[PDB]
């Protein structure tokens, strides 16, 4: 009787930009699935087709049955049914909010890590006038006694098998 007439539709553009396309290809199924229920929502609007009761009253010899049918039609006016799984959506909404907060703070942590890495690259002395010891200090991969030996100590000269 209220709430959602066919005019209601969420912003699909922002939602389509948010999803990673084929990584969330179920959205491509979800939109078409919701579109199919819009097709059901296209048919059967709120009011039904009006019926001219006076034409049937005059055409029928005894219009008492038409008056009884009209009275019973006006008496039987059933309203909307009951929402079933709205609480489950509300429960998953709260779970989504917790996952929203968890993903936000983890992304904030990784952003701070990337900012610290860029700060390290900003504070790193340029490779032109850099001594070899400072290259080993800034990049702690290094070489020492308990290290993999090689004729040329390179990144992957050791196993190669």
């Amino acid at each position: 009787a209220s709430k959602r007439i066919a005019r209601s539709s969420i912003d699909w553009a922002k939602m389509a930009e948010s999803v990673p396309e084929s990584q969330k290809a179920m959205y491509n199924q979800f939109k078409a699935k919701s579109d199919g229920y819009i097709r059901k929502a296209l048919s059967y609007p709120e009011q039904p087709s009006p019926i001219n009761w006076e034409h049937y009253r005059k055409s029928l010899t005894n219009p008492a049955m038409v008056d009884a049918f009209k009275k019973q039609y006006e008496a039987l006016k059933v309203p909307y049914p009951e929402d079933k799984v709205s609480s489950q959506i509300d429960a998953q909404e709260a779970e989504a909010k917790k996952e929203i907060t968890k993903f936000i703070q983890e992304s904030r942590g990784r952003i701070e890590n990337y900012k610290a890495e860029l700060g390290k690259l900003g504070q790193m002395i340029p490779f032109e006038h850099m001594t070899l010891e400072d290259f080993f200090e800034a990049f702690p991969e290094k070489v020492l006694n308990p290290d993999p030996p090689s004729p040329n100590v390179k990144k992957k000269p050791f196993k190669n098998n």
């Binding site: 049937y56 055409s59 029928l60 010899t61 049955m65 038409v66």
Partner: protein, 53 residues
């Protein structure tokens, strides 16, 4: 629509029944005194049309 078609079907059979009843009753009700009165009226109507000229 069911009540309208039921009314139409009952109206049609009643119209057919009253038509054949009237035809049979008119044909079976022939009297000579009324026949002579209708004959006199036909002659008077013929005479009235002759005057109307």
């Amino acid at each position: 629509d069911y009540h309208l078609e039921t009314e139409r079907a009952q109206r049609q059979i009643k119209q057919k029944n009253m038509v054949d009843w009237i035809v049979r009753n008119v044909m079976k009700s022939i009297t000579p005194e009324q026949e002579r009165l209708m004959l006199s009226k036909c002659i008077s109507d013929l005479k009235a049309m002759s005057i109307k000229a």
